[PDB]
Design a protein around this motif. Structure first.
Motif, PDB file in Angstrom:
ATOM      1  N   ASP A 169      48.551  37.908  45.228  1.00 38.98           N
ATOM      2  CA  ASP A 169      50.135  36.668  45.567  1.00 38.98           C
ATOM      3  C   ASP A 169      50.226  36.641  46.783  1.00 38.98           C
ATOM      4  OD1 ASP A 169      50.750  34.875  44.274  1.00 38.98           O
ATOM      5  OD2 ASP A 169      50.623  35.839  42.166  1.00 38.98           O
ATOM      6  N   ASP A 177      52.190  33.876  48.091  1.00 39.27           N
ATOM      7  CA  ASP A 177      53.159  33.568  47.908  1.00 39.27           C
ATOM      8  C   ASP A 177      54.151  33.945  46.624  1.00 39.27           C
ATOM      9  OD1 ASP A 177      51.418  32.964  45.436  1.00 39.27           O
ATOM     10  OD2 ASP A 177      51.139  30.634  46.327  1.00 39.27           O
ATOM     11  N   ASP A 219      53.271  33.407  42.817  1.00 37.60           N
ATOM     12  CA  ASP A 219      53.443  32.524  41.934  1.00 37.60           C
ATOM     13  C   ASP A 219      53.015  33.419  40.504  1.00 37.60           C
ATOM     14  OD1 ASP A 219      51.162  32.783  42.459  1.00 37.60           O
ATOM     15  OD2 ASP A 219      51.070  29.352  42.538  1.00 37.60           O
ATOM     16  N   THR A 278      49.967  33.509  39.471  1.00 46.69           N
ATOM     17  CA  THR A 278      49.067  32.971  39.616  1.00 46.69           C
ATOM     18  C   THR A 278      47.975  32.616  40.651  1.00 46.69           C
ATOM     19  N   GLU A 337      42.431  31.146  46.500  1.00 46.23           N
ATOM     20  CA  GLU A 337      43.292  33.113  46.397  1.00 46.23           C
ATOM     21  C   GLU A 337      41.198  33.316  45.991  1.00 46.23           C
ATOM     22  OE1 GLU A 337      45.893  31.729  44.131  1.00 46.23           O
ATOM     23  OE2 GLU A 337      47.234  31.763  45.582  1.00 46.23           O
TER      24      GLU A 337
HETATM   25 CA   LIG Z   1      48.608  32.729  44.516  1.00 39.53          CA
END
Ligand SMILES: [Ca+2]
Ligand SMILES: [Ca+2]
Ligand SMILES: [Ca+2]
Ligand SMILES: [Ca+2]
Lengths: 141, 142, 142
Positions: free
Chosen positions: C15, C17, C19, C21, C26
Motif C-alpha cells: 500500500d 497510498d 488505502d 486496498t 498495484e
Molecule cells: Ca492502494
C-alpha cells in the motif's frame, strides 16, 4: 464401432503435416491450415489409418513408397505406429521393409517441410519423428 | 520365465482392471509395476525403469496391457533373437484371447513427457512459493 | 504467529497510498516486482477468481486466502527430489545448468527469462555449470 481420435501431426522437423485438397501432402508453418487436421483410426493393434479431414482423403501408401492421396480404403492405408525412445511417434508401412535388412519405410519429412520417399526415411532420423497434438476423441465406422 | 508369471500377470490385471476394460491409468502404473511378483515386478523407485520403457499412452493418459506386458517381459528377456518372434506369437495369442474390438485405441502421447511435465509443474510451483516468501521478507524490513 | 506479521509486512510493501486496498494497477506493479509481465486481462482474472466483495480490491483476509492458495503445497512433498531425479539423466546428483534452463523454459508452466536467470544464479553457487539439485531442494524448502 472404432474408437479413434482427431489430431494435428507435428513433424519434429518443424512443420504441421498438411493434406491439401489436391492430394498434395507437405509440412507447413501455418497453425490454422485446416488441411493440417487428421483422423487417426485404430484399424488394428498398433495399426492406424490416417485421413486428411479437409479432403476426406486417406493418406495411403502405394507400391513405390509414395504417400499419395486415396479415396478408397486399401490395405495399403495400414500403418504400424510405434514410439521411438519413448519420446517420438512413428508410422511405418505394413508392406514396406528393406526386404533384406528388414528396415521398414516410414512417413517422413526433410528439413524443408517436404515429403520424403519411404526408404530414405530412417526410424532414428528426425524425419520419421512426429508428435500428435490431439483435438478430441471420436467414434468411427 | 514361466507360465506362472503370465497367469500371475492376468491375476494382478483382474485386480487393476476389475471391469476388463483392458486399460489402466498411468498414475497407478508404478504401483502396479511394484505390485507384481518377481522377476516381472519392478520395485519402487521404478520410475526411471518405467520411463526408459517404450510405453505408449492412449487418451486420456491410459495404457494397454499388451504393451506393459511386452515391456516388463522384454526387460528380462533382453534383446532378441527368438524372444521377439515368440513376442509376436504371444501377442497374437493375446489378441485372439481378447474379447470384443473396442479396446483397440490409437497412440496419443507417452510417459516421460507426462512425468517431465508433472516435474516441471512441481518445481515451478515451489519456486513461485519461494519468490513470494522472499518478497514478504523484503517487506518486513521495513 | 510470525505468519500474519509477514502478511502485515506484505500489505505494507503493497500500500503506497495506504488505502487498505489493492488495485489492478498495484497488482500489476507487484507481479512485475516478481518478474512477471501480466496483461490487464490476466490481472482482472487474478482478481475475479479471488474477489469475494468484487470491490476491485484485496483486503487483509482476501490477501490471506490468495497467499494461502499460493503457499499451500499440492504436488510438493519435499519429494520434489523425485521431480529433479526425472531430469537427472545419469543420476549423479548434478544437472547441467544449460539443460535445466532449457527444460524450465520449454516444459510445463514455463518460467520467464528473469525467473530462470534468478533460479540459475541461486542453484549454481560455484558456477561450474553443474547443479547439485539436492542442496537446491534444501534451500528451497527452508
Ligand atoms: Ca492502494
Ligand atoms: Ca475486497
Ligand atoms: Ca546429470
Ligand atoms: Ca555448480
Amino acid at each position: 464401432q472404432l474408437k479413434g481420435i482427431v489430431t494435428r501431426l507435428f513433424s519434429q522437423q518443424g512443420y504441421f503435416l498438411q493434406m491439401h485438397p489436391d492430394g498434395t501432402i507437405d509440412g507447413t508453418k501455418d497453425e490454422n491450415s485446416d488441411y493440417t487436421l487428421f483422423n487417426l483410426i485404430p484399424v488394428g493393434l498398433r495399426v492406424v489409418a490416417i485421413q486428411g479431414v479437409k479432403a476426406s482423403l486417406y493418406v495411403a501408401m502405394n507400391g513405390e513408397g509414395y504417400l499419395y492421396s486415396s479415396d478408397v480404403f486399401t490395405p495399403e492405408c495400414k500403418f504400424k505406429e510405434s514410439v521411438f525412445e519413448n519420446y517420438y511417434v512413428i508410422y511405418s508401412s505394413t508392406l514396406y521393409r528393406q526386404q533384406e535388412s528388414g528396415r521398414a519405410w516410414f512417413l517422413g519429412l526433410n528439413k524443408e517441410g517436404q515429403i520424403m520417399k519411404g526408404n530414405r526415411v530412417k526410424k532414428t532420423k528426425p524425419s520419421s519423428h512426429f508428435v500428435p497434438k490431439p483435438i478430441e476423441v471420436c467414434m468411427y465406422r | 520365465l514361466s507360465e506362472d508369471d503370465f497367469d500371475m500377470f492376468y491375476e494382478i490385471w483382474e485386480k487393476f482392471d476389475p471391469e476388463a476394460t483392458q486399460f489402466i491409468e498411468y498414475s497407478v502404473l508404478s504401483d502396479f509395476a511394484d505390485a507384481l511378483s518377481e522377476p516381472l515386478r519392478i520395485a519402487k523407485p521404478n520410475q526411471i525403469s518405467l520411463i526408459n520403457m517404450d510405453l505408449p499412452m492412449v487418451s486420456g493418459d491410459r495404457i494397454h496391457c499388451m504393451d506393459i506386458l511386452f515391456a516388463f517381459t522384454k526387460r528380462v528377456l533382453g534383446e532378441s533373437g527368438e524372444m521377439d518372434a515368440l513376442k509376436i506369437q504371444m501377442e497374437e495369442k493375446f489378441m485372439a484371447a481378447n474379447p470384443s474390438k473396442i479396446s483397440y485405441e490409437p497412440i496419443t502421447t507417452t510417459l516421460r513427457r507426462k512425468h517431465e511435465e508433472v516435474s516441471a509443474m512441481v518445481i515451478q510451483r515451489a519456486f513461485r512459493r519461494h519468490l513470494l516468501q522472499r518478497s514478504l521478507k523484503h517487506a518486513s524490513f521495513l | 504467529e510470525e505468519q500474519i506479521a509477514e502478511f502485515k509486512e506484505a500489505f505494507s510493501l503493497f500500500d503506497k497510498d495506504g488505502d487498505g486496498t489493492i488495485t489492478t494497477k498495484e497488482l500489476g506493479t507487484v507481479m512485475r516486482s516478481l518478474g512477471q509481465n501480466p496483461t490487464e486481462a490476466e490481472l482482472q482474472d487474478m482478481i475475479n477468481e479471488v474477489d469475494a466483495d468484487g470491490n476491485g480490491t484485496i483486503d487483509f483476509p482476501e490477501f490471506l486466502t490468495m497467499m494461502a492458495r499460493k503457499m499451500k503445497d499440492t504436488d510438493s512433498e519435499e519429494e520434489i527430489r523425485e521431480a529433479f531425479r526425472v531430469f537427472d539423466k545419469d543420476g549423479n546428483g548434478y544437472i547441467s545448468a544449460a539443460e535445466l534452463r532449457h527444460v524450465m523454459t520449454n516444459l510445463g508452466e514455463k518460467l520467464t527469462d528473469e525467473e530462470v536467470d534468478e533460479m540459475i544464479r541461486e542453484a549454481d553457487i560455484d558456477g561450474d555449470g553443474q547443479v547439485n539439485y539436492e542442496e537446491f531442494v534444501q534451500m528451497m524448502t527452508a
